[PDB]
Design a protein around this ligand. Sequence first.
Ligand SMILES: CCCCCCCCCCCCCCCC(=O)O
Length: 132
Amino acid sequence: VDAFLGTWKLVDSKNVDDYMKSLGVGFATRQVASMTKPTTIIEKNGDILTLKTHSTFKNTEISFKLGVEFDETTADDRKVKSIVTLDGGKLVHLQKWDGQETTLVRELIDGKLILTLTHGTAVCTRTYEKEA
Ligand SMILES: CCCCCCCCCCCCCCCC(=O)O
């Protein structure tokens, strides 16, 4: 996981509105989200990973061990069962609730961190660049 660690800032986003609409996020929150550029911080302490997402709108923090299920409350206030794993070099975060699923897949391409979010038929891609 070591190549994922650090501070990353959003530089590009495609289809976030479609993804949020699929999740049932209301139009006013979608407005703010389409204009926010979060910072994501990924840190490790032994086998515990901490993932922070900071912005002017909402802040979230989760800590987890790879491969061990945990309870998570998401930024849009879903209560989900989550698991994060390493699969083919990608960090795969699966959230399950009410019989639904959404995946958040992070992969490193050319030194950038690409986050792909899928729910239903909606696919959003967000690109993050590393801050020194
Ligand atoms: C947490 C910053 C985004 C603000 C949007 C809050 C309501 C939508 C939340 C949808 C799930 C989280 C999306 C994560 C996107 C990312 O980390 O870039």
